[PDB]
């Protein structure tokens, strides 16, 4: 077999070009560019990689970006006050708070202080619950980017038997609610599942989000399945590989996302899309 | 022959536990929990609703407060009442009866209720918190079903659980309760291909379609736990579930009768939710 590639690098470029074109049209009409704000408490190389990636995502489409770097000693009360200020700032469309926050700060209270209309990551419980109850607003980026992939490849979802491997808050759980919204029969597997293969073997649409290199072998995959690999696993040797053994799954799948170049770029593209949506639909209509 | 999941008896146990906790609060000099019910307009449906909640409160020694507003009530006046009740420290739960007059935005009113007073559990914040494995107040019917399984000492971790129906009121939140309980969780619905295959593999089957005899009994896996949420009134006055009982009960290890199964757990769980709001969120010791 020769599965077709789900070329997320190319689809993400299309999404960024569409956003950039809408930003240019707003500018031409005398309207402000969307703005993204990133908040960090303390610093380290990883968090500065986080900031820089959000910065360059903004510059590729013409958003304004702002970064707050607060000292490690910042108190919960000071941080909630900053969130309040950003919630009230009409030039800010999206707020991101980088996690790990220092020991002693209630992470959940800070994140839930963000107004759901500026929660462009889509993780505020209000936004997750809206998605669950079929009235989505801002949606978690990785599942929404996967739905975009399926739509852009003209994959009919109604009636597919879809299996999600992994029940994380960031991917697996909201993925199940996106797939239900798209009319798939949905199964979520996780660490307590008896026999992963029996569920995987019947999946027309397989979403793998376990964070383990080469965990899913080609032999488990249903012939003709659509295989979406969310893993981005860094190996000793600098290479990045998926949660699925690509060479063996590609023998059986009809479509497959490579890693790198599949789901990865779509997650960032969906953050950007969400920020434009917040600006256009919720703030400056 | 299947053992019966006697929801009438379990519901009475839960109500009695709530009542005895209220007794202990009174003995300690603490206030009874309070429920407020808001109706706009009056028809037999709304009056049955209020009577039912007042009854449930009286049974367990709660305070209940009923507001009956005329159909002339504006949206602004209703939201101001919700604001007043959100701020009232003697009120632990707020219920707003639907339908509301055509000129009122139902969603804006229901989402104005503070989530820690949303004892029905359907505020998106509460649904999202359950999705994110950090439940607060939870939808009553799915939470009552989890209670039934606990009281019969049914181990849910690892079960292959199949929900039939993806409604907002039952199927979707049921799936997130089941994931929280460690089940491998499949949600089927009107677009599911070959339902029988899913049913034949289910260790735990929750049926919530509202169609009499939709699932034939011989589809049930030998040894399954069968939870029937249907309450279907037939021509001849009989009340029947979504699963054909006689045939299912020859195969299941456990089965809920209809009536007297899931039905009584819904109101019992509302009362339990109201006590939880009081004891945990409003007047903790």
Residue numbers in the entry:
A (entry chain B): 1 to 285
B (entry chain A): 2 to 286
Pull text from the paper.
FolD occupies a central position in the folate-dependent C1 metabolism. The secondary metabolite carolacton is a macrolide keto-carboxylic acid produced by the myxobacterium Sorangium cellulosum with an elusive molecular target.
After lysine methylation, this protein crystallized in the same space group as the wt protein and crystals diffracted to 1.9 Å. The overall structure of ecFolDMethQ98H is not altered when compared to wt as a result of the mutation (Cα rmsd 0.11 Å) and the effect of the Q98H mutation was unexpected. The presence of H98 allows the side-chain of Y50 to rotate 90° compared to the apo wt ecFolD structure. It appears that in the wt protein, Q98 helps to position the side-chain of Y50 such that it can easily rotate to engage in hydrophobic interactions with carolacton (or substrate)  upon binding. In Q98H, the side-chain of Y50 is able to rotate farther from the active site and packs against residues V38, L40, L96 and H98. The binding of carolacton to ecFolD Q98H was seriously attenuated as reflected by the SPR data. The mutants G8S and Q98H could still be inhibited by carolacton, but with much higher IC50 compared to the wt.
